[PDB]
Structure formats: C-alpha cells, structure tokens
Amino acid sequence: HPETLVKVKDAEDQLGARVGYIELDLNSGKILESFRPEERFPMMSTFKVLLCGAVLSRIDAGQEQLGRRIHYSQNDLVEYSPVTEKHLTDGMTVRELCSAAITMSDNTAANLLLTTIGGPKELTAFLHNMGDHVTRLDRWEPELNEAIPNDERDTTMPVAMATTLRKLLTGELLTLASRQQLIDWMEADKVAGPLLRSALPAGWFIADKSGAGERGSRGIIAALGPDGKPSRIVVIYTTGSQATMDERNRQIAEIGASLIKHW
Numbered sequence: 001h002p003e004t005l006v007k008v009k010d011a012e013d014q015l016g017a018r019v020g021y022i023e024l025d026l027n028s029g030k031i032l033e034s035f036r037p038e039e040r041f042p043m044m045s046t047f048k049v050l051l052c053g054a055v056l057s058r059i060d061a062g063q064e065q066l067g068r069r070i071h072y073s074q075n076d077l078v079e080y081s082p083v084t085e086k087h088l089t090d091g092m093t094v095r096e097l098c099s100a101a102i103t104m105s106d107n108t109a110a111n112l113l114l115t116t117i118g119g120p121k122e123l124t125a126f127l128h129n130m131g132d133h134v135t136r137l138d139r140w141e142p143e144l145n146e147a148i149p150n151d152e153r154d155t156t157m158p159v160a161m162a163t164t165l166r167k168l169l170t171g172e173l174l175t176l177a178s179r180q181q182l183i184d185w186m187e188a189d190k191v192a193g194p195l196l197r198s199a200l201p202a203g204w205f206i207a208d209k210s211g212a213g214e215r216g217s218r219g220i221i222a223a224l225g226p227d228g229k230p231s232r233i234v235v236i237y238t239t240g241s242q243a244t245m246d247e248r249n250r251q252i253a254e255i256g257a258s259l260i261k262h263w
C-alpha cells in the first residue's frame with residue numbers, strides 16, 4: 001500500500017539516510033511495494049540466513065551432517081559470540097552453530113560455518129548458482145560490517161535479497177525438511193524484538209533475521225503473515241544515519257506498523 005511508502009520516506013527524513021524496502025508476495029514472487037529496490041546496502045548479519053542455506057544444501061547432498069561436532073578454540077572467538085563463548089570445552093555441532101548464528105546472531109558461529117563451506121567466495125558462488133548475481137560476501141566477521149560508503153563488498157539489494165530468500169524458503173533448491181529447518185531457526189530469532197516483532201499482531205507468523213553494522217547500518221529480512229502462516233517477504237535496510245540504535249529500531253518498527261495496518 002502507498003501509505004507504507006509515505007512512512008518509508010518519513011523514515012529517511014527522520015534518520016537522514018537511505019532506506020531500502022521491498023514487500024514481496026511469497027507465493028508468486030510479485031513485488032507488491034518497493035523503495036530503492038535496486039540500490040546496494042550492507043547485509044550485515046542478515047547474510048547468516050544465506051550461509052545456513054548453503055550449509056543445508058551441503059547436508060542435503062551428503063557433504064555435511066547436522067550432527068558433526070566442530071572443536072574450536074578461544075583463538076576463534078570474535079566480538080559478539082554469546083553462544084560459542086560458552087561451549088569452548090566440548091565444541092558445538094553444525095546444527096547448534098546454525099541455530100546460534102541465526103537465533104542469537106553469534107559472530108564466531110558464522111565464521112566457523114563460513115570455513116566449513118569454503119569461505120565468502122563459496123557462499124557467493126552458491127548465490128550466483130541459484131540466480132542471484134547481485135548479493136556478494138567478501139569478508140568474515142566482524143570486518144564485513146564496515147559499511148564503507150559506496151563499497152560493494154558484503155552488500156545486496158532489497159530486491160535481490162527478497163527474491164533469494166523466497167527461493168530458499170519455497171524453491172526446489174533445498175529439501176522440504178531443510179527448508180523447514182531454516183524457517184524454524186528464523187522463527188526462533190531471539191534478538192529482533194524491537195523491530196518488526198514489536199508491531200506484529202497476535203496470531204501472526206514471523207520468521208526473521210536482523211543486522212547491525214557501522215555507520216548507522218541496520219536491517220532485517222522476514223517472512224510473515226496472518227493466521228500463523230507466512231505469505232509475504234519484507235526486506236528493510238538502512239545505512240549512513242548518525243541516529244542511535246533506538247531511533248533506528250523505532251523507524252523500522254513504525255514501517256512494520258504501517259505494513260501491518262495496510263496489509
């Protein structure tokens with residue numbers, strides 16, 4: 001609905017920075033609404049969903065196992081590793097790492113998984129192979145959050161991320177069991193409270209993944225819908241703002257409120 005675009009423009013006024021937005025129909029892939037859909041924005045932690053999508057594909061192909069245990073050390077710990085820092089002694093399984101990377105946005109977990117698949121260059125190749133010639137991962141955590149103005153490293157476009165997420169969640173790329181596992185991890189997101197979730201009505205479904213980086217970079221990708229079933233994909237990214245985290249959170253939540261109101 002165009003009233004949501006009014007709010008998105010208002011968010012740009014409030015934050016003094018670009019805001020990229022897209023609403024996509026999950027079933028048909030039809031673009032319902034867009035704002036700067038083809039401009040690049042840093043992915044930040046939203047790439048973690050793509051990463052686990054690549055891991056799940058390897059599992060489907062028998063090249064990896066959900067139960068395989070990874071024995072890392074304190075040398076691997078990077079900033080913001082709430083889960084991995086507590087399991088140094090016994091390590092964690094691939095399933096646990098993806099759960100941690102998605103639900104808690106654990107940085108070390110992402111790096112560990114990144115190594116198992118072959119690094120940023122393999123994740124980018126995976127994306128390219130599934131039709132996404134835009135999204136690219138170049139660095140590891142935490143460097144990928146730099147958000148240098150005009151830098152194309154570690155970026156995506158709202159339309160690319162949206163269509164890629166649709167394919168991962170509903171396409172034939174992953175087995176049904178794996179598609180469900182990915183959605184299950186996203187639905188269990190514990191760190192996106194003040195964003196779209198704060199505007200979600202009772203009974204609605206939401207599977208998401210947020211990100212922060214930087215130069216005011218903030219973003220979120222989500223699959224949501226009424227009656228406990230997702231029917232649309234929403235992608236929101238912003239970068240460049242000098243506003244506080246709270247201010248950025250509020251704007252995203254208000255865009256969400258408009259989106260829901262005009263569903």
Ligand SMILES: *C(=O)[C@H](CO)[C@@H]1N[C@@H](C(=O)O)C(C)(C)S1
Nearest residue numbers: 044045080105191210211212213
């Ligand atoms: C990803 O953008 C960062 C780690 O690089 C994680 N996601 C943030 C967020 O979504 O708010 C975080 C502060 C939970 S850490």
